[PDB]
Design an enzyme around this catalytic site. Structure first.
Site, PDB file in Angstrom:
ATOM      1  N   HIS B  15      10.623   9.986   2.820  1.00 26.28           N
ATOM      2  CA  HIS B  15       9.786   9.142   1.980  1.00 26.28           C
ATOM      3  C   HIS B  15      10.373   7.743   1.881  1.00 26.28           C
ATOM      4  CE1 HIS B  15       6.920  12.174   0.160  1.00 26.28           C
ATOM      5  NE2 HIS B  15       7.761  12.944   0.830  1.00 26.28           N
ATOM      6  N   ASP B 112       5.175   5.821  -4.817  1.00 29.47           N
ATOM      7  CA  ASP B 112       5.124   7.063  -4.074  1.00 29.47           C
ATOM      8  C   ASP B 112       4.021   7.972  -4.603  1.00 29.47           C
ATOM      9  OD1 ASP B 112       5.764   9.822  -3.253  1.00 29.47           O
ATOM     10  OD2 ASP B 112       7.511   8.872  -2.315  1.00 29.47           O
TER      11      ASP B 112
END
Ligand SMILES: O=c1ccn([C@@H]2O[C@H](COP(=O)(O)OP(=O)(O)O)[C@@H](O)[C@H]2O)c(=O)[nH]1
Ligand SMILES: O=c1ccn([C@@H]2O[C@H](COP(=O)(O)OP(=O)(O)O)[C@@H](O)[C@H]2O)c(=O)[nH]1
Lengths: 425, 429
Positions: B15, B112
């Site tokens: 990520h 995110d």
């Protein structure tokens, strides 16, 4: 002495070819064969094959059974009429002379005729046309439907639902009920006979080896592989073509391809950049004239075994009918797998695991709405035809297949041993 | 004023890498990026990577929000993945004040997906535009967006871009049990993502034309298309050994930052790689005793972190065996290395379909997942690996993938243009 075996086939070349080939092998090991063919025949064209085969030798005899015909589904009507006479067949079986060592019947009619055979104390063996994975699905599906999942003991921890035959998707279906019956019925049979070998489906067979028939013996008996005009414009053309340079595309007896899908397959072959032999009022007017140099397409029935064994053909685009798979295995043609319906998807899985060829899983079934793009079709054909390692893997299948077929192999031993079950003292 | 953007990445190199690459891309097009990094850092190793990035230039900045202490009685199920998520999620309410106080004011907040449910309400209160960066593929994005509708339906998955009847095996193993916190967390995030002002993905039109086309339709952003594709974001012992090796001869095998492969499976990959007879650089206890000696001429197996981008760009590598992490899939696509897709967990199975559809690589569907435990035998690994290297058509397909991916990435490309347009939104009158 010479045992007497009665064969009860079902409609359709896919079922018919194995039975002829199974009959041929039984005659070669000394048995005498009596085909039970009910009348009137569903197909005149399929009847010619049986006639010529039976005509060739006194070791085979034909028995005509009156269909005695009385949801109105078209294929089912033939089977219903085919299955209606089930009770009546019983006396006819006992009347046949010399007394039959055993009866060998098609899976589809397994539910109907198994009680008749049990009634007269006649051993009943089932001929399974499909792969061991398909058989493994069939045997265990009744248990699965109760508490489902979809773990098929032979080849799937969790089988994708798409891989199941398209009719089987909805449980409250006429097809689903018959399917559960056949599976349950097959366990009761004296034996099951499949056209597979250990090399081709070790996993599915090994799981299958555990399954046990009621009569103190393994339920499943693998005798595979079995080995035994429109081509007139084809064979001369193929001989001109360079070795292993021609794609061969055929969907077997039933090829329900939509015209939209058809145009794309045709475009892919042109865009493939390799020669192709295709068997099926052109949709493209000049397509045929334009592509004549690169490939020939014929609408008639052809000679798949000669094509598969032909030196110039290098790859096989297939619908993964079990008979064509075994023939492709023998040929050692690398197979691009486009399973069209029913058990053909499971058969595609067998093709990939075996290394006989590669299967674009994301490609759709007949039920699926989405078409397969030509550009995608052209890529895989070009890739299949140009992959040497794929060729080499296919050649191993062939060797292994021949090994089982050749004398002393696991398959010929099983056929020898099966025959003895008939030559009882 | 020059636009100021706030980044709040979740933990994990898979990520974190897009955020950093997006931050560099945004900075390149005249942006100052402020990284919202919490304290205590989840990982020192990741934190050191980020610190080095901030040091690179004045445009990148670091701001730290201390995580609120957990209430021990309140915690549920004792899971390390969820507890870490829970502490970051719990500081959501606290985050709004800090965001408003930043100097200079932020043009937008980009967060995110995992933390999007917790933080999206915060943004609306302070009237700050929130964009979600989607680490995975467009197909996966399609599943998240429509999974809530599917769950309350179903008969068939039918993810709009991915397929008509997506197989349950292809779904992430946690999703298989619907009555789970993960399955509920997944369902919340998907719903949340529609509300957000925009969704950024590491994809391009060339790579996923069908799935992107469907997403063009959703346009859930108020007055604009929801999905913004800016992909592909672009930013030791091993190399020396690579340089020795002949052109396009080396099989690269790596499963990313998290590669849980069982001991029994591990033996098979080694045997398979050994048996294939082609060269191989395998990245990851002596499971094989004489394995390394026998194959020492043929291949290098190392356990460290490695410069995957250099590997994939190296001329001596010819094929890539991967877990189809979107970061790995996109890197290979720029490299044009053909892929052998062995998805291991989560969204990787959906990524494998994109690799097969693209022509970038071939996916052996029958290969097992970490969930199910029937091992992949060495006979199959050796044949599939060797065939991939042997197959020239597969290289051509990957070459075509690279061209289009380069096209999108270069000036005037779909994404480069789309990235340009996004920076304009941050700079209005
Ligand atoms: O034009 C043809 C078409 C088919 N076959 C035969 O069709 C057989 C089996 O068909 P398959 O099971 O593979 O397809 P299905 O009949 O089940 O649709 C194969 O043995 C082929 O020999 C042939 O010989 N010439
Ligand atoms: O030894 C390694 C393993 C991974 N990576 C990087 O980790 C990135 C993303 O890994 P991916 O998302 O594809 O898989 P995940 O880490 O999420 O399982 C890739 O871009 C690689 O650059 C690396 O540099 N060295």
């Amino acid at each position: 002495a010479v045992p007497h075996v009665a064969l009860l086939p079902s409609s359709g070349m896919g079922h018919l070819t194995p039975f002829l080939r199974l009959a041929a092998a039984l005659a070669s090991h000394g048995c005498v064969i009596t085909f039970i063919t009910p009348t009137p025949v569903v197909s005149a064209a399929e009847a010619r094959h049986v006639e010529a085969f039976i005509s060739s030798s006194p070791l085979f005899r034909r028995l005509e059974f009156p269909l005695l015909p009385f949801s109105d589904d078209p294929f089912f009507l033939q089977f219903e009429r085919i299955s209606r006479s089930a009770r009546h067949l019983g006396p006819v079986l006992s009347s046949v002379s010399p007394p039959l060592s055993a009866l060998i019947l098609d899976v589809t009619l397994t539910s109907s005729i198994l009680p008749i055979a049990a009634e007269i104390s006649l051993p009943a063996y089932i001929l399974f046309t499909s792969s061991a994975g398909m058989l493994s699905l069939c045997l265990s599906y009744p248990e699965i439907a109760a508490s489902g999942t979809i773990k098929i003991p032979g080849v799937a921890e969790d089988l994708a639902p798409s891989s199941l035959p398209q009719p089987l998707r909805d449980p409250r279906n006429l097809f689903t009920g018959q399917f559960i019956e056949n599976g349950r019925a097959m366990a009761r049979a004296d034996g099951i006979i499949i056209n597979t070998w250990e090399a081709l489906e070790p996993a599915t067979l090994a799981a299958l080896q555990g399954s046990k028939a009621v009569s103190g013996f393994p339920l499943v008996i693998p005798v595979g592989p079995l080995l035994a005009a429109a081509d007139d414009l084809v064979i001369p053309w193929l001989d001109a073509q360079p070795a292993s340079s021609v794609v061969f595309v055929s969907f077997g007896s039933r090829t329900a391809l939509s015209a939209e899908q058809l145009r794309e397959l045709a475009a892919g072959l042109e865009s493939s950049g390799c020669r192709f032999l295709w068997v099926l009022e052109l949709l493209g007017e000049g397509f045929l004239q334009r592509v004549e140099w690169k490939g020939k397409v014929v609408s008639g029935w052809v000679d798949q075994r000669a094509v598969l064994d032909h030196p110039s053909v290098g790859g096989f685009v297939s619908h993964c009918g079990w008979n064509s798979v075994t023939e492709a295995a023998l040929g050692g043609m690398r197979v691009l797998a486009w399973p069209r319906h029913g058990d053909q998807r499971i058969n595609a899985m067998v093709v990939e695991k075996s290394g006989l060829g590669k299967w674009p899983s994301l490609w759709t079934w007949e039920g699926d709405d989405e078409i397969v793009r030509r550009e995608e079709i052209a890529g895989r054909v070009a890739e299949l035809m140009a992959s040497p390692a794929a060729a080499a893997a296919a050649a191993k299948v062939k060797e292994e297949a021949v090994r089982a077929a050749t004398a002393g192999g696991s398959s010929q031993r099983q056929l020898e041993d099966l025959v003895s079950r008939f030559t009882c003292s």
